[PDB]
Tab-separated table of C-alpha atoms in Angstrom:
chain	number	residue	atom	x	y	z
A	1	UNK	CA	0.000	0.000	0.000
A	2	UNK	CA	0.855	3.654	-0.750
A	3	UNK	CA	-0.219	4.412	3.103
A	4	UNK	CA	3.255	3.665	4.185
A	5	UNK	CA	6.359	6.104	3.016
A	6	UNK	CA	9.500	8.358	3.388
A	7	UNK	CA	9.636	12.040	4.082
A	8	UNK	CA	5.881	11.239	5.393
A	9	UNK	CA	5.079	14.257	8.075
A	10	UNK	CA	4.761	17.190	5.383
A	11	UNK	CA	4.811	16.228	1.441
A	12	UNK	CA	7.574	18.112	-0.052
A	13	UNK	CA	8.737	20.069	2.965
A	14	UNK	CA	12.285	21.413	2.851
A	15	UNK	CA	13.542	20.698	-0.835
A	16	UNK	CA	16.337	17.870	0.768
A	17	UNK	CA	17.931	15.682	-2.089
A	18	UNK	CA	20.393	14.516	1.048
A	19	UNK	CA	17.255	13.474	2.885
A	20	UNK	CA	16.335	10.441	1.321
A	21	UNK	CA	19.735	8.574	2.118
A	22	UNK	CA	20.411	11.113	5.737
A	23	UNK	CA	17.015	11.946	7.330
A	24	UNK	CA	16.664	7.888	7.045
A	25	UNK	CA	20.033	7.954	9.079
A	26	UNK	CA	19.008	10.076	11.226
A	27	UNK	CA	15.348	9.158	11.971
A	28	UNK	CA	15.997	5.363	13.207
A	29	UNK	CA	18.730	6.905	15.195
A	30	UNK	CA	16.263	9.652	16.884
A	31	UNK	CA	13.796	6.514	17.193
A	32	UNK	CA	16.875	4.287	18.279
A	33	UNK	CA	17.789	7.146	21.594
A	34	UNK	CA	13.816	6.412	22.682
A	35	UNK	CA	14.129	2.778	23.283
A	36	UNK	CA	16.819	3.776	25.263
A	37	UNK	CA	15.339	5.864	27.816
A	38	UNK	CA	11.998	3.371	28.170
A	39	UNK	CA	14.989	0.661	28.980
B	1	UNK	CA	11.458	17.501	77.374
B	2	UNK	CA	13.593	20.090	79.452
B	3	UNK	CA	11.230	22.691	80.841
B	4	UNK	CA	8.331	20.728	82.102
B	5	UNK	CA	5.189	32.338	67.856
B	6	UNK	CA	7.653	29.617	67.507
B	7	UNK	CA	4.392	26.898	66.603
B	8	UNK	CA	2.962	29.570	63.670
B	9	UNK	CA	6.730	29.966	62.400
B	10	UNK	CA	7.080	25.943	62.336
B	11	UNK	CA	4.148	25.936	60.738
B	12	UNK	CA	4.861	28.488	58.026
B	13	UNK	CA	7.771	26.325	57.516
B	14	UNK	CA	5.789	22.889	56.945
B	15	UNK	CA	4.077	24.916	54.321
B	16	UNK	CA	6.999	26.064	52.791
B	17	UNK	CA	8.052	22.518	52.238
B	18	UNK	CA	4.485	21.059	51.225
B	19	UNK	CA	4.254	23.784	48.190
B	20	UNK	CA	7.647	22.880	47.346
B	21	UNK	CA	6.963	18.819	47.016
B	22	UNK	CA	3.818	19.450	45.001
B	23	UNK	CA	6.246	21.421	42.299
B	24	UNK	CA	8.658	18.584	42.272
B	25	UNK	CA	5.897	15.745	41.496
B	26	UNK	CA	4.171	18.086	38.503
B	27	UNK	CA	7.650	17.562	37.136
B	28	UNK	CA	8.763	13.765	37.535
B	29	UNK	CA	4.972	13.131	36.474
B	30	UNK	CA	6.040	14.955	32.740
B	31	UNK	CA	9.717	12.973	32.785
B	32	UNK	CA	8.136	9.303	33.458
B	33	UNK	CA	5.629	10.493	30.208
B	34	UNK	CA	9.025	11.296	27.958
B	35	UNK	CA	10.463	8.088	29.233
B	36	UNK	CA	6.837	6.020	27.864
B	37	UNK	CA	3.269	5.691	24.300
B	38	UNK	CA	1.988	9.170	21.833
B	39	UNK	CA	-0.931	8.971	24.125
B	40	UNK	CA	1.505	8.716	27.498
B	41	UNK	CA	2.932	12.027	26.513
């Protein structure tokens, strides 16, 4: 399905070419620091 | 024990401390929501 995505919060927001292989860098890491402070 | 104004003062003093505690447990009641959970926070 077309439900799931990248760059999903705003469509076209920012104009970032590095996004696509940096933002998904840097979003499992800002997701990876919240496991860490439930454990 | 010894002897067989200060009370108020005491007193004013409990209070003092019972304001304080109800500040510090608004606070670790927003940092156990940040540790949950997009409902929790």
């Amino acid at each position: 399905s077309p439900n799931l995505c990248k760059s999903g919060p705003e469509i076209k927001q920012t104009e970032d070419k590095k996004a696509m292989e940096e933002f998904k860098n840097v979003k499992i890491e800002d997701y990876e620091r919240e496991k860490m402070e439930n454990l | 024990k010894g002897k067989t104004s200060d009370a108020q003062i005491f007193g004013k003093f409990d209070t003092f401390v019972r304001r304080l505690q109800k500040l510090i447990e608004i606070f670790s009641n927003i940092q156990q929501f940040n540790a949950l959970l997009e409902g929790m926070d």
